[PDB]
Structures are given as C-alpha cells and as structure tokens.
Write a protein that binds this ligand. Structure first.
Ligand SMILES: Cc1ncnc2c1ncn2[C@@H]1O[C@H](/C=C/CNC(=O)c2cc(-c3ccc(F)cc3)cc(O)c2O)C[C@H]1O
Ligand SMILES: [Cl-]
Ligand SMILES: [Cl-]
Ligand SMILES: [Cl-]
Ligand SMILES: [Mg+2]
Length: 213
C-alpha cells in the first residue's frame, strides 16, 4: 500500500463517520506522528477557514485534491446549497478523496472530478453547468498554477470578485504565478504568512481577487 491509503485507513480506524472535524484531526495526528504528507495542514487550514467564512462562496473549485483534507476543510464550512468541485489527476487519490468525503458525510456537497485540470476546466460550463466560480483553491503541481489561472480566464469562468487562494507560495513556491498575479492590474493580492504543514518552516497563502479584464 501507499502512504495515501495508510492515511485513509487511519481515519477509518480512528475518526467518527459524519464528523468532519474528527476526520481532519485524525489526518493531522497521523501526519504529525507517523508519516508527513502534503495536506494543507492545520496552520494554513485555519487561514483557509477564515477566508471561506469571510466570503461565503456558493461555488468553489479546488485544483489538486490529494487525499481530500482541504476538500473536507472547505466543504464543512460551505453554506447550505453551496458546492465544491475538486479536480484530481491521480485516480488513486481521486478515489481516496471520494472515500474521505463519504466518511466525513460531506459527499452531497462535493463533486470529485478525476482528470487533469487543463482537460477538465474547458468542460465546466457545458458538462458541469458552471457559469462562473466564486472561489478557486490552487494546490496542485506548482507549475500549473499560472497556466490554469490563464485557462480559467480564457474559458470565461472568472467573474469580477472571484477569489483565488493559492497554497505554497513560499514553499515549494510558484514563482511565475506569484509574480504574475502581484504584477497584474487584474488581481488584488494579499499574502497570509503561515507554516508548511506539520513543519516549523514558513509558508503562506496568496489571495488574488480577480478584477475583470
Ligand atoms: C494538472 C493537475 N490536475 C489535477 N490534479 C493534479 C494536477 N497536478 C497535480 N494534481 C494533483 O494535486 C496533488 C499534488 C500537488 C502538488 N503539491 C505539492 O507538490 C506540495 C508540496 C509540498 C512540499 C513542501 C516542502 C517539501 F519539502 C516537499 C513538499 C507541500 C505542499 O503543500 C504541496 O501542495 C496530487 C496530484 O495528483
Ligand atoms: Cl490537502
Ligand atoms: Cl498533465
Ligand atoms: Cl500544521
Ligand atoms: Mg499544498
């Protein structure tokens, strides 16, 4: 088995079904005590929670589910009727994420799309009946943040006021994306300093609010 499967099993052996907080705590405990993994973690997760509560988005897109930790984090704070779409290229991770959400009781709020973001993004309008996104959480391969931001715009999926929230803008970093949004008159940017998941290493989230063309 894989580390990802081991995290899911620990949740199944240690958390309460239908209790998102107990799922998050179990993941954090496993990744602190047993094996590190690239979940967004509790430090940055608390910032994410405060941003999601502030904006109360009706439709969120996540790029890069991994094991579903961030999807559980976000979905548990969505207002009734609001929804999350999460894209995950690795079929094993897509299935783990679906199972994590099922365990947490959040499955009716989330759609887990198994595929590459650059292939799925152009299908959101026609196949998934999306108009525009209220929020986008970027947490996939770091060289894809900028290409996918540009693709989202091309596809008409951003509106004035869409909130981009990007993980890992310090470590590993996403230098092209970060320079681009910070230099662009089409984004208003704010940096939230924090810590790499499960580590005493500085990281941060970037909030980049789209201003329109
Ligand atoms: C194109 C595309 N479409 C859909 N899913 C995609 C995708 N590219 C990746 N994915 C999925 O996102 C996930 C991957 C994300 C990449 N994230 C990382 O590489 C990552 C790495 C670190 C890190 C920090 C310090 C260190 F010393 C070592 C590592 C920390 C993090 O928080 C991360 O998100 C899983 C993958 O299948
Ligand atoms: Cl995560
Ligand atoms: Cl790819
Ligand atoms: Cl943490
Ligand atoms: Mg990350």
């Amino acid at each position: 088995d894989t580390k990802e499967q081991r995290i899911l099993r620990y949740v199944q052996q240690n958390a309460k079904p239908g209790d998102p907080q107990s799922v998050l705590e179990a993941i954090d405990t496993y990744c602190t005590q047993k094996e590190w993994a690239m979940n967004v973690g509790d430090a940055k997760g608390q910032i994410m929670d405060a941003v999601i509560r502030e904006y109360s988005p009706s439709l969120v897109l996540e790029l890069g589910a991994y094991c579903g930790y961030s999807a559980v984090r976000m979905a548990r704070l969505l207002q009734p009727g609001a929804r999350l779409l999460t894209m995950e290229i690795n079929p094993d991770c897509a299935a783990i994420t679906q199972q994590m959400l099922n365990f947490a009781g959040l499955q009716d709020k989330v759609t887990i799309l198994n595929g590459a973001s650059q292939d799925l993004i152009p299908q959101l309008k026609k196949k998934y009946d999306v108009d525009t996104l209220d929020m986008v959480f970027l947490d996939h391969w770091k060289d894809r943040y900028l290409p996918d931001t540009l693709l989202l715009e091309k596809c008409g999926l951003l509106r004035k006021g869409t909130v981009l929230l990007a993980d890992n803008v310090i470590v590993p970093g996403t230098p092209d994306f970060l320079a681009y949004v910070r230099g662009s008159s089409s984004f208003e940017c704010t940096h939230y300093s924090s810590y790499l998941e499960y580590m005493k290493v500085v990281d941060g989230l970037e909030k980049a609010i789209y201003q329109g063309p």
